[PDB]
Ligand binder design. Structure first.
Ligand SMILES: CN[C@@H]1[C@@H](O)[C@@H](O[C@@H]2[C@@H](O)[C@H](O[C@H]3O[C@H]([C@@H](C)O)[C@@H](O)[C@H](O)[C@H]3N)[C@@H](N)C[C@H]2N)OC[C@]1(C)O
Lengths: 292, 172, 159, 72
RNA sequence: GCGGGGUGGAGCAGCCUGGUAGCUCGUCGGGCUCAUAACCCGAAGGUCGUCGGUUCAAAUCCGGCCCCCGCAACCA
RNA sequence: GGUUGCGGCCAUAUCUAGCAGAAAGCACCGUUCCCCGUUCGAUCAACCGUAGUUAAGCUGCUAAGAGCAAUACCGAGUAGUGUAGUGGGAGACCAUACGCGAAACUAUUGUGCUGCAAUCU
RNA sequence: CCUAAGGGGGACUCAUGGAGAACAGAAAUCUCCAGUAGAACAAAAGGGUAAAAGUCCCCUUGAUUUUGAUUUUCAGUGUGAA
RNA sequence: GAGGUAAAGCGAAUGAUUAGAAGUCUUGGGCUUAACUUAUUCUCAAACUUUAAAUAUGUAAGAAGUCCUUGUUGCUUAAUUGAACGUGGACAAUUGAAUGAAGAGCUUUUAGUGGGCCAUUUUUGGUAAGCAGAACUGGCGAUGCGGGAUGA
């Protein structure tokens, strides 16, 4: 009774979206506004903090855009945190702060801005932008890129923001999306934010769930029990991690159990082959013959 | 593994939506909102008319109906009370092609709601939405996609699941 | 009456190409323009700001000014018995580098390289381009290529 | 038919010709080509017109459509 | 080249300014008279010429068509 | 070579129907004290990586597949067109000389390439 | 003609069709699926636009101040507009 | 580089349009007239279009250029990054296609004119017109001369 919609004209006149738009990964509106540079600032690139959250990892890459593709300046991953003393909760707000701090420190170390622009060592949770030093280089300026993730107050992307800003990068931002902002009274509750930086909310959950349902605590916090880390022992974990990151932020790759040749050799055993023309023709001819 | 017996293909209720389309506003729509708020334990939301029909005594952007969506244990409890009121009696017509179904109740007081002359009697509509694990891929913001054909729900499998789990009859 | 508005007669010139609608690919915004570059003007119908007039659509000029989001291009326009220098502000979506210039710079580089080679080698090289000359003499074999005779064919109808 | 078209010519302005076509009916094939297609089972009736075999597309559908086709 | 109209059965309003179709006569039911007329008590009847558009909403505003009525068509 | 994050060009990348996927990654997946958002913890927010699964997403393979792309003794030097004649023809129009030159149609082939960074049985 | 129908941000996806749900039927409301825009964007027509330029929500007044450069119409005068 | 006219196309979008065939009756009058769907079929568009010429059209082919080193700045960069203009050094007649060039450039001042008309091609209104109106070019007007008998 109704027309068959999937016609060959519908497919012929269909304009496919950009490949990364149809994978639902790039917002090109936001990307245009982020990347485009003042034309009187001729070849000086704009820099982005890409912050991406998978189910098990946190990615922080400092990226500048080019015609043939984006170029990574430095990158930091949450799976590097076991080297700095954080083993569990690698998608926390606190791990997010640690990753931001790590990428900021690695960037400043690679750029030579270590002695100048140390950052904020005595972390108290106060909104603070990195300020330039007189008669000297301006701070490394990057712009936060959260991609498709929604802006909410108390979101982990702004935890990475806070870490990168405290590492000494200059990242423009306002404090009204940190955990602790009061909309009715527009001030930042700095104690609550500093609690979030040092894992305090996780420790509060540990205390409450131990006092209420020790079986649920047993299941959820099993890793902490195995290491016998109690709720009082978390702030030191994150503080020691911050100290270790600030002491040595150099990148160390995970040593490869095989080289690229072995890796390519092993996976090719599980790639299917394309049929050649002779083979598809043979299949067609046999399918005609069998049909009688 | 490529198996249909996998634990991730098991059907279950996504949501129940309670619908009362009283055709107008006033004390009737307020009362219907109150009865939904009691039955669901959740505040319901009014729906406006999308345009004006003089046969229906209805006006564009004028409050008429009220609905609430319910999911979780509450959804299945209200579902089984509704099927009791139906006496576990549904038809193959009730089941949609995609794999949902619903029915109609002429009185909430049949479900076990204490009768109140302040509120009275209101007919109601039930509609459950089926689904499997991984329906998030069509709902999330990032990397949204579609569900593969063998994972999709459908009429026949939903009738099977209903007859099995609820031990009812689907009068074909 | 007659109508001579700003965008009159631009029904097709300002349309987007077939299956080329929508967002601008970011390579447009990453190109770098300098004063003295030669650029081609092409109005993009989806960017209503900083557009050329229809006269400058398809013209080529010199960049003389660079601002936040746009360049200033110098065009020569015939008005009666002389040209007038025109100055147009164009957002970078409507502008593109000209390719013939990059080819000419390639030739300048190659020519310097060749002259340096000849200098350091003790000979002289002629560096002016030349138009195609008449062909020289040649001898054609008939090995496997005996001349084949063709004749005009008779009229036929195919109705 | 030629005489019928001859009479109808007088109703028009200008000059017109009556041409006998080499082709089979209203089809775009010569008589011999239509016979050669017919004997290979590549044509079916579509009422007043016919349909021709395409060696492109879904093989099973094409083979159902023209059961008499003699693949060579 | 024009300007005015089309609305219960009839003649007429409501159009100007979009939200309920009004007046007189007429029709139908009952009463009064031996019956009629007058009179008395009650009821029906036009989607507004048609085809569309605009609008939340059209008899109402706009366009095309049909039927009606008339105005004007001069200087040689 | 697989995979992920950010991309460039933006269907050879799309679409339909089947099949297969080791490791890692990605993913689905559990939970609601906390920041946060909803009629609804479905989306969004946070927490656990702990209880489960390659079912789906994703990737690759298949189809005389649809679409797309490319090529050609394909049609066709055809349609059209610049220049010329005191060319032809009542005329509509047509040929010739010096030049340019399609689209449909027909046939065959192909079905992403790639930059940076990290990671992997 | 518009205090938004101007400015910024966010979230969402439109016309239409199919299959379902008491009253409820072709048109009331709810659910899912398909859907390149076949909708919408004050007003003519054309162009443009889909994680938007459309719809909804939040905050606003850049519809502000100072005078210069430029484009169209063009005499390269004015006015209007940009 | 730009273009959307000629041509072409419509079993490609929009709009127009001839004929059957097969399905769905669930959609309406009475074995089926009609709608609808599917694959076909004939014919079209100044205010339709995927494609798309020929002619016409924009720009470049260096000395005001290229290369090396490093000066200025209150602009710009995280920066010793750049931007613009430079100092000093290198490249000299093939100084970077052809053909031509009673030379190039600059200024003042003032006349007449501001009814046009014709021919080939393109083209609009009109039955058409030695009619009315546009485009490019060449002419007549302003021009005699040989030819078309005669004739802007
Ligand atoms: C290919 N297209 C052609 C186009 O080339 C042109 O053709 C002319 C033609 O019209 C000329 O012919 C024209 O002019 C001559 C005479 C006055 O010169 C007349 O005799 C003739 O009637 C007239 N048609 C002919 N002499 C040259 C072709 N190139 O004009 C006609 C056309 C069909 O458009």
């Amino acid at each position: 009774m109704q027309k068959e919609f999937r016609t060959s004209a519908y497919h012929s006149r269909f304009q496919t979206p950009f490949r990364r738009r149809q994978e639902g990964k790039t917002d090109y509106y936001q990307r245009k506004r982020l990347v485009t540079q003042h034309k009187a600032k001729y070849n000086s690139p704009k820099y982005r903090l890409v912050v991406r959250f998978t189910n098990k990892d946190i990615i922080a890459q400092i990226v500048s855009a080019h015609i043939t593709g984006d170029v990574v300046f430095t990158a930091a991953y949450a799976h590097e945190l076991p080297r700095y003393g954080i083993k569990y909760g690698l998608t926390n707000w606190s791990a997010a702060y640690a990753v931001g701090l790590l990428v900021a420190r690695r960037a400043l170390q690679k750029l030579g801005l270590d002695e100048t622009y140390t950052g904020v060592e005595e972390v108290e949770g106060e909104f603070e932008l990195t300020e330039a030093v007189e008669d000297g280089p301006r701070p490394f300026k990057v712009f936060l890129d959260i991609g498709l993730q929604r802006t909410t107050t108390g979101a982990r992307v702004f935890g990475v923001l806070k870490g990168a800003s405290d590492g000494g990068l200059y990242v423009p931002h306002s404090p009204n999306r940190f955990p602790g902002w009061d909309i009715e009274a527009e001030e930042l509750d700095a104690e609550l934010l500093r609690k979030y930086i040092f894992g305090g909310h996780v420790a509060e959950y540990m205390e409450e769930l131990l006092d209420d349902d020790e079986e649920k605590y047993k299941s959820i916090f099993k890793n902490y029990i195995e290491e016998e880390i109690e709720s009082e022992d978390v702030e030191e974990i994150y503080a020691n991690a911050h100290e270790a990151i600030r002491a040595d932020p150099s990148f160390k790759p995970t040593e490869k159990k095989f080289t690229k040749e072995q890796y390519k050799a092993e996976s090719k055993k599980y790639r299917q082959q394309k049929l050649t023309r002779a083979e598809r023709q043979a299949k067609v001819a046999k399918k005609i013959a069998e049909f009688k | 593994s490529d198996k249909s017996q996998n634990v991730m293909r098991e059907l279950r209720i996504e949501k129940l939506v309670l619908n009362i389309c009283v055709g107008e506003s006033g004390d009737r729509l307020t009362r219907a909102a109150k009865v939904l708020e009691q039955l669901s334990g959740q505040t319901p939301v009014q729906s406006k008319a999308r345009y004006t029909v003089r046969t229906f005594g209805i006006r564009r952007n004028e409050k008429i109906a009220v609905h609430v969506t319910v999911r979780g244990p509450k959804a299945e409890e209200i579902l089984e009370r509704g099927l009791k009121v139906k006496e576990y009696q549904l038809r193959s017509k009730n089941f949609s092609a995609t794999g949902n179904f619903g029915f109609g109740i002429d009185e909430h007081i049949d479900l076990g709601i204490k009768y109140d002359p302040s509120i009275g009697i209101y007919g109601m509509d039930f509609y459950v939405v089926m689904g499997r694990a991984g329906a998030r891929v069509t709902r999330r913001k990032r990397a949204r996609s579609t569900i593969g054909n063998s994972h999709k729900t459908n009429k026949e499998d939903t009738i099977q699941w209903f007859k099995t789990r609820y031990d009812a009859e689907v009068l074909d | 009456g007659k109508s001579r508005g700003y965008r009159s007669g631009t029904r097709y010139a300002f349309q987007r190409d077939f299956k080329k609608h929508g967002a601008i690919p970011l390579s447009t915004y990453l190109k770098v323009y300098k004063v003295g570059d030669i650029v081609d003007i092409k109005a993009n119908g989806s960017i209503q700001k900083g557009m050329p007039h229809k006269y400058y659509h398809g013209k080529t000029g010199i960049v003389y000014n660079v601002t936040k989001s746009s360049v200033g291009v110098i065009i020569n326009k015939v008005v009666g018995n002389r040209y007038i220098e025109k100055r147009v502000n164009l957002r970078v979506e409507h502008v593109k580098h000209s390719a013939c210039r990059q080819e000419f710079l390639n030739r300048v580089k190659s020519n310097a390289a060749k002259k340096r080679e000849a200098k350091a080698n003790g000979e002289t090289v002629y560096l002016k381009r030349q138009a195609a000359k008449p062909r020289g003499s040649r001898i054609i074999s008939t090995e496997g290529n005996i001349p084949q005779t063709l004749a005009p064919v008779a009229y036929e109808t195919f109705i | 038919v030629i005489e019928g078209l001859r009479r109808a010519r007088y109703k028009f302005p200008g000059q017109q010709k009556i041409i006998i076509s080499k082709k089979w009916g209203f089809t775009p094939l010569n008589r011999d080509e239509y016979i050669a297609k017919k004997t290979n089972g590549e044509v079916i009736d579509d009422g007043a017109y016919v349909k021709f075999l395409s060696r492109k597309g879904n093989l099973e559908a094409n083979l159902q459509q023209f059961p008499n086709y003699q693949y060579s």
